[PDB]
Amino acid sequence: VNSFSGYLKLTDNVYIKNADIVEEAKKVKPTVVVNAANVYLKHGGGVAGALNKATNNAMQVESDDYIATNGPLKVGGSCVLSGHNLAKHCLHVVGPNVNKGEDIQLLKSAYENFNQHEVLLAPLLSAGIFGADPIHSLRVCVDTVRTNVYLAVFDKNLYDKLVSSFLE
Ligand SMILES: O=C(O)c1cncc(-c2ccccc2)c1
């Protein structure tokens, strides 16, 4: 049903809310929730851990089965798997891990995957343990994605910084 509420317009196609993406997926019933994935689709923490836990490990069993056919994803790559109880689809997207010297230029490639989906509920890619500046990631989102993105940002202090950088 894609019932997004309380999202702040940043651009004509990029929206942002200070919210837990799991709680968002349960209220919004989005067609697509984006996972901040690693190449092995091992959902051990952050957004991936959160989404998987909310599926009571359904996502992790499907993910393994995919990895068995594919081997690992490419950095900048994605797959479309079931959203389980959270969404029709989960778009698992691998942003570069700049901690491991993966090139920040691959963040554009990661966001380009969003353009395959009319409307997405999504985190910022390559933030947190992936080590990219989240405000940089938002700029790459805005520059790259032309389909309708609804970004959920868990942390209020980071949310305010993001909105201050974008609108002030
Ligand atoms: O089956 C569909 O066409 C569909 C499309 N978008 C969202 C959903 C959905 C997503 C989460 C919960 C319940 C329903 C289903």
N→C terminal distance: 33 Å
Helix count?
Answer: 6
Number of strands: 7
The strand line-up of the biggest sheet is 1-2-7-6
CA radius of gyration is 15 Å
**Total domains, how many?**
1
Structural class: alpha/beta
Shape: globular
Task: Estimate the helix proportion, in percent.
Answer: 25-40%
Q: Order of SSEs, N→C?
A: EEHEHHEEHEHEH
Describe the sheet with the most strands: 4 strands, mixed
DSSP strand content: 15-25%
Q: Which hetero compounds are present in the coordinates? A: 5-phenylpyridine-3-carboxylic acid
Protein name: Papain-like protease nsp3
Catalytic activity: Thiol-dependent hydrolysis of ester, thioester, amide, peptide and isopeptide bonds formed by the C-terminal Gly of ubiquitin (a 76-residue protein attached to proteins as an intracellular targeting signal)
Subcellular location: Host endoplasmic reticulum membrane
Subunit structure: May form homohexamers. Interacts with N protein.
Describe it.
The protein is an alpha/beta fold and 168 residues long. It contains six helices and seven strands. The protein is 36% helix and 19% strand. Bound molecules: 5-phenylpyridine-3-carboxylic acid. It is found in: Host endoplasmic reticulum membrane.
Topology:
Elements (H helix, E strand, L loop, with lengths): L7 E2 L4 E5 L2 H8 L3 E5 L9 H9 L3 H13 L7 E5 L6 E5 L12 H7 L6 E4 L11 H11 L3 E6 L2 H12 L1
Parallel strand pairs: 2-7, 3-5, 6-7
Antiparallel strand pairs: 1-2, 4-5
Helix pairs in contact: 4-5
